[PDB]
Amino acid sequence: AGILFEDIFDVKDIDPEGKKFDRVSRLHCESESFKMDLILDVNIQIYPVDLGDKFRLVIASTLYEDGTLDDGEYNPTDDRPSRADQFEYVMYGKVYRIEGDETSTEAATRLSAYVSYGGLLMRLQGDANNLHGFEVDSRVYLLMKKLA
Amino acid sequence: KSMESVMVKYDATVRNSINQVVQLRYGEDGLAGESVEFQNLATLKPSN
Amino acid sequence: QKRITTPYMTKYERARVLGTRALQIAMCAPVMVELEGETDPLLIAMKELKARKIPIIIRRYLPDGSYEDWGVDELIISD
Amino acid sequence: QGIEQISKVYMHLPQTDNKKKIIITEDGEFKALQEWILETDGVSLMRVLSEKDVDPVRTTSNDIVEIFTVLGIEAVRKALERELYHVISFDGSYVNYRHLALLCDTMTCRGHLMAITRHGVNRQDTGPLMKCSFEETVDVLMEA
Amino acid sequence: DREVLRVIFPTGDSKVVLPCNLLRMIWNAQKIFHINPRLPSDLHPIKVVEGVKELSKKLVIVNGDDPLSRQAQENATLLFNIHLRSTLCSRRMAEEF
Amino acid sequence: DDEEETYRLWKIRKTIMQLCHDRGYLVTQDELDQTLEEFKAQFGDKPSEGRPRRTDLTVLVAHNDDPTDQMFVFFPEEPKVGIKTIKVYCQRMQEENITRALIVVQQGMTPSAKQSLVDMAPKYILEQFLQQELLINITEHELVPEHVVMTKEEVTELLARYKLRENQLPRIQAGDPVARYFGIKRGQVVKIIRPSETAGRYITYRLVQ
């Protein structure tokens, strides 16, 4: 499947500190299944998001849903079936930091994964087992679908 | 005019036209000013 | 043997070796390197420097009055 | 009372760390102590250093000539570096130390304070042609 | 080296000017070789100790084996070698880098 | 005042002990770290019309390498040292056969006496020191780096390593306060060790001239 993480999030705050940028809002969302905390920068102009909105978030290493690596270049002419067809908001980014509660001896129980989608930042907190597919410097796809 | 002749010689010392030693090594470390960078000594500040 | 000066070619030696060799090439001196569609004497000297084929010896005068003769091939080029 | 040539003495607590007293504690940390420092309007370095309750290790004069005649050529070499560093870095400007160190070395290489004027640059045993190009073109060449 | 530094910088200002940016060089190495900070390292701690010792000998400012040249070489690179040792130490090469 | 004046005598003596120790002369540890009370107890009174006399404060020390070699430190009582006073010390040095001596003058030396020291310089080395100068150890100042007098063997090694001539080194005046502190004559080389913010440590050499 090539899916690193999938869950349903509910928007709690849209911009707690304030509207830092006009076309981008910082969503503060929490999941109910895995109880993962999500901070996400979204292009609010093209994909408006409101408080209490529920959406399905999928973090995948590829869009082709066949295991084939995208190679990270723009290929609009590709007709291969894409997992992006099922989602409304698709972002391509790079994970640049993986933090955790690890100590010198004990491992990490909570992991934070930071992804930059061309400058739009996402932090995904929660149990380490839920973020084992995240490896720093790896390219990931963010796929969002608002749920009614 | 007071330093136009001071130069780094091939023995790596700094001397004037008179060939008198101004510095045994340029800058006391023998390095040029373009390459060095600001850096932090990590062992100075921290406590025992 | 018994050389105390740096094994690297200085920026000032590179500037004069290339300039001096370019003039020699410009004056119909034999080119030690194989050139393909190169006609600028200064670019040819760069190829020879990279190939370590410049037939020039740098004589570095020490402050005490002595000198060390280095072949351009012996010295380490910055590139 | 007091010492001659010292007209006014200012006492104040140095807020900046440069004039503060930085020590190493038992734990090995760097602790800055808020201690009084006196700044005078005149220079009597030799007299003031000998005074009781005056620190003879850090007490310093901004007068380069006073440092030379009291502490020596190497002390004035360091003092000259600090004073020159003060004017350069006063506005936050930065110059690599090697350039500052080189100027100070040339001004103290001969064992005495050499000014960067004609009285110090033409007195050094350089060739007359170098001297004539700087200043006193004819007087330098007439003497040669 | 810590005590030597305390004498050189009694004010405790650790900001210095040195030739090579070791922290950025380490950062370059992490990216070039795709170092994974989470996984255990295969770099033996002794290789770090021996490797730095060999490196220090290669960084020569005052060549010569006589005691006068050796002392000047030690003095010329004293600050960098202290910075090099406290950055490429075995503890830190295995703990954070 | 006498409490203030006795403080000067103790402080001046302490600098002399450090000066003698720094010159290689055998000065015992307790002499260097001698408290004012210990000095006051040792002499047991105050200067003015009391036990501690500048004549009784004279110090004799012997070089560590050569026990026969020795040095006097004389504290003349008169404010201005005259020719007769120097001859008294000069005659005394003959009895003990001591070549080098130090005269800690109160205010200054009469010009004839100053010339007298130079006249007898070859046979006997007499060094004038002002009382104000000795009240502090300039070598302990932060601006003053570590000065080390180089042996002739070391100086030969130094010039050979750098292929240098004596006149090519940086100079230090013979009248330099640190040069006077170490009693270095013309032609000697001082090894100055400095902390360097770039290199960490820097050694420079100054010829006395």
Side-chain angles (χ1 to χ4, degrees):
Chain A
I3 284 162
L4 308 174
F5 172 87
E6 167 161 20
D7 205 88
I8 291 152
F9 290 83
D10 287 285
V11 183
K12 306 299 203 241
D13 281 328
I14 294 276
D15 272 314
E17 307 195 359
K19 196 73 167 299
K20 297 290 197 323
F21 306 93
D22 288 309
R23 291 155 269 152
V24 174
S25 288
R26 178 161 282 203
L27 309 186
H28 288 248
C29 316
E30 288 181 352
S31 174
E32 53 265 19
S33 175
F34 289 132
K35 302 295 185 179
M36 317 283 292
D37 199 17
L38 171 69
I39 293 166
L40 180 56
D41 282 312
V42 171
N43 190 347
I44 206 74
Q45 206 192 34
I46 65 180
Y47 196 65
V49 184
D50 293 330
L51 283 165
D53 277 6
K54 192 188 284 289
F55 61 91
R56 189 203 319 158
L57 181 79
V58 174
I59 309 300
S61 51
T62 55
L63 288 179
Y64 304 131
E65 64 172 309
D66 305 331
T68 315
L69 292 173
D70 56 302
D71 194 272
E73 69 286 357
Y74 188 46
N75 205 342
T77 50
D78 200 338
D79 57 354
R80 187 184 285 155
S82 185
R83 174 164 26 231
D85 167 56
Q86 289 84 23
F87 296 87
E88 307 164 329
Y89 188 71
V90 179
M91 275 199 306
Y92 180 64
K94 183 174 178 178
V95 56
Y96 65 89
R97 169 167 286 264
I98 286 164
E99 269 164 7
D101 274 337
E102 63 268 7
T103 72
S104 45
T105 62
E106 166 162 79
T109 71
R110 296 287 301 286
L111 268 182
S112 315
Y114 300 73
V115 181
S116 181
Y117 301 93
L120 302 185
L121 307 190
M122 179 202 83
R123 186 215 279 170
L124 195 61
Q125 278 185 349
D127 309 331
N129 49 301
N130 291 314
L131 307 171
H132 275 166
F134 286 90
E135 169 153 291
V136 174
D137 288 332
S138 69
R139 311 292 173 152
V140 298
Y141 280 99
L142 178 143
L143 298 102
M144 268 173 70
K145 189 178 185 180
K146 197 181 288 185
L147 305 175
Chain B
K1 303 302 298 193
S2 75
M3 298 195 285
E4 54 178 6
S5 47
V6 180
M7 185 179 78
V8 178
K9 304 302 192 143
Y10 271 105
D11 74 330
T13 59
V14 179
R15 302 170 187 234
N16 53 23
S17 58
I18 309 154
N19 215 5
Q20 296 162 341
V21 169
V22 190
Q23 307 181 317
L24 286 171
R25 282 290 175 287
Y26 178 44
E28 307 165 0
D29 57 3
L31 303 175
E34 298 95 350
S35 306
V36 296
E37 293 177 58
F38 280 111
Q39 286 169 76
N40 276 94
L41 297 161
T43 296
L44 178 73
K45 276 183 135 195
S47 79
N48 287 309
Chain C
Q1 61 280 306
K2 313 207 83 172
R3 283 144 156 194
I4 52 164
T5 57
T6 178
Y8 296 81
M9 192 196 262
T10 75
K11 68 173 81 175
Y12 310 109
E13 289 162 5
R14 197 212 311 116
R16 204 167 140 194
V17 162
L18 283 166
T20 291
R21 182 51 175 165
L23 179 58
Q24 289 172 356
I25 289 153
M27 292 171 84
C28 295
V31 183
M32 305 289 103
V33 76
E34 200 78 71
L35 60 90
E36 55 276 15
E38 292 292 329
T39 54
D40 185 45
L42 191 56
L43 287 171
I44 299 159
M46 283 290 290
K47 285 172 77 71
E48 287 178 337
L49 186 68
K50 289 167 170 193
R52 296 180 180 277
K53 299 292 182 187
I54 299 192
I56 290 170
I57 295 157
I58 192 66
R59 159 163 298 166
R60 308 168 151 171
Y61 290 104
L62 294 153
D64 64 6
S66 76
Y67 61 79
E68 305 178 359
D69 274 5
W70 289 76
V72 163
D73 52 358
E74 303 168 16
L75 291 165
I76 296 156
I77 314 309
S78 76
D79 60 80
Chain D
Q1 198 176 8
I3 293 156
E4 293 83 1
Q5 306 144 302
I6 287 161
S7 77
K8 196 174 281 291
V9 183
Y10 293 100
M11 161 161 62
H12 72 101
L13 286 175
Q15 293 182 357
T16 50
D17 292 331
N18 58 342
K19 268 177 283 200
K20 263 160 149 185
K21 182 169 191 252
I22 295 90
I23 55 157
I24 295 156
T25 76
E26 273 187 275
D27 305 327
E29 301 154 309
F30 271 109
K31 192 190 183 163
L33 314 185
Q34 193 69 84
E35 286 191 354
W36 292 100
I37 57 175
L38 316 173
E39 304 175 320
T40 80
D41 204 0
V43 287
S44 197
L45 184 62
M46 191 81 257
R47 294 282 301 284
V48 176
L49 285 163
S50 310
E51 293 299 326
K52 199 191 162 287
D53 292 329
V54 160
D55 202 357
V57 176
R58 294 147 65 206
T59 296
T60 312
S61 185
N62 79 334
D63 180 33
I64 304 308
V65 180
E66 186 80 20
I67 293 283
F68 177 52
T69 183
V70 172
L71 300 180
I73 191 67
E74 275 292 330
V76 74
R77 158 62 175 80
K78 188 70 182 205
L80 189 57
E81 164 196 339
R82 310 218 291 210
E83 292 303 321
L84 272 165
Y85 174 84
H86 192 61
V87 294
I88 287 154
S89 86
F90 159 68
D91 56 297
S93 198
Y94 166 80
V95 174
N96 200 295
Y97 161 86
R98 68 194 63 262
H99 305 295
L100 175 52
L102 195 61
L103 173 62
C104 295
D105 275 318
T106 61
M107 292 170 76
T108 66
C109 189
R110 292 294 96 201
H112 54 73
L113 275 165
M114 188 208 79
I116 306 301
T117 76
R118 61 199 177 75
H119 307 287
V121 172
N122 285 11
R123 294 300 96 73
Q124 57 178 354
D125 52 356
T126 55
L129 288 173
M130 182 181 285
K131 285 181 212 208
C132 83
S133 63
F134 172 34
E135 287 185 352
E136 296 170 347
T137 309
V138 180
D139 287 12
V140 160
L141 293 173
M142 296 314 292
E143 291 177 307
Chain E
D1 296 354
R2 189 161 175 266
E3 308 314 322
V4 168
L5 283 182
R6 297 292 177 95
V7 182
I8 299 158
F9 311 100
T11 184
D13 185 55
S14 62
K15 186 172 173 177
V16 286
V17 184
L18 285 179
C20 312
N21 211 298
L22 305 178
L23 289 189
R24 188 210 304 140
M25 280 168 168
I26 287 149
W27 197 3
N28 302 351
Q30 292 166 341
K31 303 290 121 173
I32 293 155
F33 301 89
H34 314 281
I35 298 300
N36 191 333
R38 318 294 294 181
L39 307 178
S41 178
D42 69 348
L43 174 66
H44 206 289
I46 202 73
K47 296 288 182 291
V48 173
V49 178
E50 273 161 0
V52 169
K53 274 161 166 289
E54 296 156 10
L55 176 59
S56 160
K57 299 177 210 294
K58 282 157 163 107
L59 319 177
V60 171
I61 290 294
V62 186
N63 58 356
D65 291 331
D66 58 277
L68 212 71
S69 307
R70 278 197 267 91
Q71 190 59 55
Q73 164 57 22
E74 204 267 357
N75 289 355
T77 57
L78 178 72
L79 198 59
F80 187 66
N81 283 117
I82 292 163
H83 177 58
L84 184 76
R85 276 191 284 284
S86 62
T87 295
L88 305 185
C89 59
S90 53
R91 169 73 162 178
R92 198 184 282 191
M93 269 288 138
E95 192 172 0
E96 53 172 294
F97 302 139
Chain F
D1 183 284
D2 288 8
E3 184 179 2
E4 188 270 359
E5 213 286 332
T6 187
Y7 169 80
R8 301 219 210 85
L9 296 173
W10 164 68
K11 187 67 71 176
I12 289 152
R13 186 180 179 81
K14 184 190 279 188
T15 308
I16 287 296
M17 293 303 134
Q18 299 167 326
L19 180 143
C20 285
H21 178 75
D22 292 345
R23 280 197 194 183
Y25 287 94
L26 177 62
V27 175
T28 175
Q29 181 56 252
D30 68 355
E31 270 182 312
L32 297 159
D33 283 280
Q34 184 180 6
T35 57
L36 173 51
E37 298 89 30
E38 189 167 359
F39 170 92
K40 189 175 73 174
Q42 180 173 359
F43 292 75
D45 212 353
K46 65 193 183 288
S48 72
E49 281 57 38
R51 275 64 175 171
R53 288 279 174 288
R54 308 219 159 219
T55 53
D56 299 323
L57 274 160
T58 287
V59 167
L60 188 154
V61 288
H63 198 248
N64 280 316
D65 300 333
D66 196 351
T68 64
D69 194 344
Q70 286 175 325
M71 194 166 76
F72 291 101
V73 188
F74 298 128
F75 297 173
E77 287 175 351
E78 53 262 64
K80 300 279 281 190
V81 182
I83 286 279
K84 191 71 153 188
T85 303
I86 301 300
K87 294 307 308 190
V88 164
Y89 294 134
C90 176
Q91 185 175 340
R92 173 156 186 188
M93 269 176 264
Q94 300 255 23
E95 307 187 284
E96 283 87 1
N97 313 283
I98 309 313
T99 42
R100 309 186 83 264
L102 268 66
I103 298 97
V104 186
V105 183
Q106 299 295 109
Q107 283 89 19
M109 293 188 67
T110 191
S112 174
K114 188 185 286 186
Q115 191 65 88
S116 177
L117 302 192
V118 181
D119 301 351
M120 65 190 291
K123 58 190 267 192
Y124 297 145
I125 302 97
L126 277 70
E127 308 177 10
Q128 176 193 359
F129 268 117
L130 287 182
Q131 186 183 355
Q132 184 60 250
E133 281 159 14
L134 272 291
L135 273 165
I136 57 167
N137 204 331
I138 55 165
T139 288
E140 285 172 331
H141 204 270
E142 71 176 2
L143 283 169
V144 177
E146 200 190 349
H147 296 62
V148 184
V149 180
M150 285 181 89
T151 66
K152 284 197 187 172
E153 284 69 45
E154 272 150 24
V155 172
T156 295
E157 192 201 356
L158 168 67
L159 302 178
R161 163 59 184 89
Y162 294 109
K163 306 290 187 184
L164 275 174
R165 292 195 312 273
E166 291 89 333
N167 65 321
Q168 279 167 327
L169 291 170
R171 313 289 190 72
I172 189 178
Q173 280 166 343
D176 199 273
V178 185
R180 296 174 48 221
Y181 180 98
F182 285 95
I184 60 185
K185 54 168 182 148
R186 188 184 183 87
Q188 279 195 289
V189 182
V190 180
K191 172 181 184 180
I192 298 102
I193 312 171
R194 291 199 272 116
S196 179
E197 69 167 81
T198 53
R201 192 180 297 114
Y202 183 60
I203 291 168
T204 186
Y205 309 90
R206 276 187 194 278
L207 179 73
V208 182
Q209 276 205 356

